[PDB]
Design an enzyme around this catalytic site. Structure first.
Site, PDB file in Angstrom:
ATOM      1  N   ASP A  23      67.224  70.913  72.392  1.00 33.30           N
ATOM      2  CA  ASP A  23      66.145  70.699  73.369  1.00 33.30           C
ATOM      3  C   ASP A  23      66.674  69.919  74.562  1.00 33.30           C
ATOM      4  OD1 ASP A  23      63.833  70.239  74.863  1.00 33.30           O
ATOM      5  OD2 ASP A  23      62.615  69.612  73.176  1.00 33.30           O
ATOM      6  N   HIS A  70      74.668  71.046  69.275  1.00 36.26           N
ATOM      7  CA  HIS A  70      73.930  71.958  68.390  1.00 36.26           C
ATOM      8  C   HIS A  70      74.306  73.415  68.721  1.00 36.26           C
ATOM      9  CE1 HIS A  70      70.572  74.118  66.614  1.00 36.26           C
ATOM     10  NE2 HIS A  70      70.372  73.030  65.881  1.00 36.26           N
TER      11      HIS A  70
HETATM   12  C1  LIG Z   1      65.283  79.358  63.543  1.00 32.69           C
HETATM   13  C2  LIG Z   1      65.721  77.918  63.899  1.00 32.69           C
HETATM   14  O1  LIG Z   1      65.095  77.249  64.745  1.00 32.69           O
HETATM   15  N1  LIG Z   1      66.819  77.492  63.234  1.00 32.69           N
HETATM   16  C3  LIG Z   1      67.325  76.122  63.506  1.00 32.69           C
HETATM   17  C4  LIG Z   1      68.501  75.968  64.439  1.00 32.69           C
HETATM   18  O2  LIG Z   1      68.654  77.069  65.365  1.00 32.69           O
HETATM   19  C5  LIG Z   1      68.060  74.660  65.083  1.00 32.69           C
HETATM   20  F1  LIG Z   1      67.190  74.982  66.121  1.00 32.69           F
HETATM   21  C6  LIG Z   1      67.554  73.529  64.029  1.00 32.69           C
HETATM   22  O3  LIG Z   1      68.702  72.530  63.834  1.00 32.69           O
HETATM   23  P1  LIG Z   1      68.926  71.115  62.939  1.00 32.69           P
HETATM   24  O4  LIG Z   1      67.850  70.704  61.951  1.00 32.69           O
HETATM   25  O5  LIG Z   1      69.371  69.930  63.956  1.00 32.69           O
HETATM   26  O6  LIG Z   1      70.251  71.418  62.146  1.00 32.69           O
HETATM   27  C7  LIG Z   1      70.407  72.716  61.530  1.00 32.69           C
HETATM   28  C8  LIG Z   1      71.902  73.004  61.243  1.00 32.69           C
HETATM   29  O7  LIG Z   1      72.499  73.094  62.559  1.00 32.69           O
HETATM   30  C9  LIG Z   1      73.883  72.588  62.462  1.00 32.69           C
HETATM   31  N2  LIG Z   1      74.023  71.558  63.539  1.00 32.69           N
HETATM   32  C10 LIG Z   1      72.854  70.847  64.034  1.00 32.69           C
HETATM   33  C11 LIG Z   1      72.985  69.896  65.058  1.00 32.69           C
HETATM   34  C12 LIG Z   1      74.257  69.650  65.591  1.00 32.69           C
HETATM   35  N3  LIG Z   1      74.425  68.806  66.588  1.00 32.69           N
HETATM   36  N4  LIG Z   1      75.377  70.323  65.086  1.00 32.69           N
HETATM   37  C13 LIG Z   1      75.298  71.307  64.085  1.00 32.69           C
HETATM   38  O8  LIG Z   1      76.324  71.872  63.645  1.00 32.69           O
HETATM   39  C14 LIG Z   1      74.056  72.058  61.059  1.00 32.69           C
HETATM   40  O9  LIG Z   1      74.695  73.092  60.254  1.00 32.69           O
HETATM   41  C15 LIG Z   1      72.606  71.797  60.613  1.00 32.69           C
HETATM   42  O10 LIG Z   1      72.520  71.755  59.166  1.00 32.69           O
HETATM   43  C16 LIG Z   1      66.526  72.688  64.542  1.00 32.69           C
HETATM   44  O11 LIG Z   1      65.777  72.120  63.698  1.00 32.69           O
HETATM   45  O12 LIG Z   1      66.689  72.359  65.703  1.00 32.69           O
HETATM   46  O13 LIG Z   1      67.020  74.093  62.802  1.00 32.69           O
HETATM   47  C17 LIG Z   1      67.829  75.249  62.379  1.00 32.69           C
HETATM   48  C18 LIG Z   1      67.990  75.708  60.935  1.00 32.69           C
HETATM   49  O14 LIG Z   1      67.440  74.736  60.074  1.00 32.69           O
HETATM   50  C19 LIG Z   1      69.480  75.733  60.713  1.00 32.69           C
HETATM   51  O15 LIG Z   1      70.044  76.405  61.853  1.00 32.69           O
HETATM   52  C20 LIG Z   1      69.915  76.371  59.376  1.00 32.69           C
HETATM   53  O16 LIG Z   1      69.887  75.446  58.265  1.00 32.69           O
END
Ligand SMILES: CC(=O)N[C@@H]1[C@@H](O)[C@@H](F)[C@@](OP(=O)(O)OC[C@H]2O[C@@H](n3ccc(N)nc3=O)[C@H](O)[C@@H]2O)(C(=O)O)O[C@H]1[C@H](O)[C@H](O)CO
Ligand SMILES: CC(=O)N[C@@H]1[C@@H](O)[C@@H](F)[C@@](OP(=O)(O)OC[C@H]2O[C@@H](n3ccc(N)nc3=O)[C@H](O)[C@@H]2O)(C(=O)O)O[C@H]1[C@H](O)[C@H](O)CO
Lengths: 322, 322
Positions: free
Chosen positions: B210, B232
């Site tokens: 976001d 992300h």
């Molecule tokens: C359809 C949907 O919205 N999917 C969303 C993803 O596009 C994103 F929007 C979000 O992400 P969020 O909780 O932060 O984290 C989900 C996964 O994203 C990777 N990550 C996240 C932040 C970061 N800085 N580096 C990373 O590598 C990790 O593997 C983490 O476990 C969301 O809530 O914003 O939730 C996910 C899914 O839950 C996830 O993609 C699959 O488990």
């Protein structure tokens, strides 16, 4: 004997890898379904694709999923609600009531209407109970048992009040008295303006996408003095000794166009029982003939095909293809 | 207020056109789903795409459909049977029991096993009944009612005997005594070989997709003396004043790799409540902190998020982002 894995997130792909690791050397077909395409998804899909026997990345549109794999913030909840379409009506093929049932349930207040899947809709219930389809353990019986189960679901689950058919006056599998049956022709006779067949005759063979049908097709063209072939959309070989029509349209579209331009011409359509014969049955100035090569077994086609063609007034012309 | 049309053949696309014609000026979203791609399908999809508000062509793999829209020949029946996979096991995310239920039913003898969808699995039943989610007609209540309905379907339809979770020792929504619960870590401690944290400390902020979070993120990085940001996978803006990690891996993969290479290093992960905090909770030498900007409302996140983070031993650090 295969294992399937279905995934819709990157981490689910890692999990899928762990599972695969615990089953070394077994066969795995992995499916990734996501609305998001970005560098990381492709990287991770490629990775699991190197590890499985077969993998596929189904790409979906943004917003498809009403559900969440993660715990959404209040903002993410707001965005999702104010994006979802407000759906008043779903139209879909009768059998899509089965294959997309899960989606219908997410819109329980939408008006649902169905249309023909195709010529499958013309096999009556009692015909599935025919002796052809009643030998336990055979391929034909599995087909009938599968159709009977699916029609039952399509007819009685997720109520729909109307079915559009493109086949005037052949009994439809969907006509069960729980819905209005509505004829929906592919054309308006008002716009077509066909008149008396005072002009000439055009003969067209409907090509087959099966390449084993090549010689038989070519022999039909000669035996029956047929000028043209209209290849099937999936046909991949060429026919010699006949003029192939290179057109972008499927036969029904092509013929409706030609009739409008040539309202006094007689079109003769010859076919190895294509469904296009039943679809074009009631087109003006169109005359369909079915072709039956002596070298094929009598049961090459299922018995209801002969019966629909015969009910529809379509001559079956047999010929010794040698 | 939209109408949807679902089609899986060319002629169904023509029918879809007829229906659209009878509803002039109304809004239509048209979906084509096919296993065959050829000149004619694209031509006809383009055609209906020019006529509808929105259209999409979902491409599927060859053989997906066990069903028929046409009346098959005996040969086509043989081909279809001897092609279909003999499936012994399906693994899928718990909520995919709902979204792909229709497919599960075509393999009624397959052993089914599920895995976590994600952090959604950690909200307990009783929590959906919480006062937060119990105001009729609100967005939060619609979410809870939707989850409750789907978990119920996932847990009681198409029996599955086992659930893999990636979250040790947090109660799972799938643990209902009708299946074995199996912990499936993302790594083996045996292969990682982490030792005492005698080396240095690495601080990483988990980036947010976001863009309204940009300034808050940048202020967190300064306030907390954080060297790095790990963007992300869907993050599309850059953060200034911090070193961005350009890596192809998601955070869990990145960190597991770095731990193996640096088994004595202390990794500190700071986050605005990413699920990666819960996913990495039990990684050795990893220490997660949640960040809470004063400028966001107390209910920015749902109450179960705070409770999972707190249950998991994850400190919540508040700061006046100004
Ligand atoms: C359809 C949907 O919205 N999917 C969303 C993803 O596009 C994103 F929007 C979000 O992400 P969020 O909780 O932060 O984290 C989900 C996964 O994203 C990777 N990550 C996240 C932040 C970061 N800085 N580096 C990373 O590598 C990790 O593997 C983490 O476990 C969301 O809530 O914003 O939730 C996910 C899914 O839950 C996830 O993609 C699959 O488990
Ligand atoms: C999944 C699957 O197998 N789909 C097949 C299609 O790939 C093909 F394989 C076949 O084709 P078939 O009965 O002959 O005819 C189906 C439609 O194809 C167009 N056509 C056919 C022959 C020809 N020479 N010129 C044409 O333009 C017409 O629009 C006709 O109505 C089959 O049985 O071989 O059945 C269809 C579907 O029933 C059809 O595509 C949608 O209604």
């Amino acid at each position: 004997p295969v294992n399937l894995i279905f995934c819709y997130t990157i981490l689910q792909m890692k999990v899928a890898e762990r599972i695969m690791a615990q089953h070394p050397g077994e066969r795995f077909y992995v499916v990734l379904m996501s609305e998001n395409n970005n560098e990381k998804y492709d990287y991770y899909f490629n990775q699991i694709k190197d590890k499985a026997e077969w993998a596929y990345f189904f790409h979906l549109p943004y917003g498809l999923n009403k559900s969440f794999n993660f715990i959404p913030t209040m903002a993410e909840l707001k965005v999702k609600a104010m994006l979802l379409p407000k759906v008043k009506r779903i139209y879909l093929a009768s059998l899509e009531k089965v294959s997309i049932a899960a989606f219908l349930s997410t819109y329980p207040d939408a008006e649902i209407k169905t249309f023909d899947d195709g010529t499958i809709n013309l096999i009556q219930s009692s015909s599935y109970l025919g002796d052809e389809f009643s030998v336990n353990g055979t391929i034909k019986r599995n087909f009938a048992r599968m159709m009977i189960g699916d029609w039952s679901i399509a007819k009685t689950r997720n109520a729909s009040d109307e079915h559009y058919t493109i086949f005037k006056g052949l009994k439809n599998i969907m006509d069960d008295g729980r819905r209005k049956m509505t004829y929906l022709p592919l054309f308006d006779a008002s716009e077509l303006k066909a008149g008396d067949e005072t002009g000439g005759t055009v003969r067209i063979l409907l090509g087959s996408p099966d390449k084993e049908m090549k010689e038989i097709s070519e022999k039909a063209a000669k035996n029956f003095n047929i000028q043209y072939v209209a290849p099937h959309p999936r046909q991949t070989y060429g026919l010699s000794g006949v003029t192939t029509l290179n057109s972008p349209y499927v036969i029904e579209d092509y013929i409706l166009r030609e009739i409008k331009k040539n309202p006094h011409t007689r079109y003769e359509i010859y076919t190895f029982f294509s469904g296009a014969a039943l679809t074009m049955k009631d087109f003006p100035n169109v005359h369909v003939y079915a072709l039956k090569p002596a070298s094929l077994p009598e049961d090459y086609w299922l018995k209801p095909v002969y019966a629909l063609f015969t009910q529809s007034g379509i001559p079956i012309l047999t010929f010794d293809d040698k």
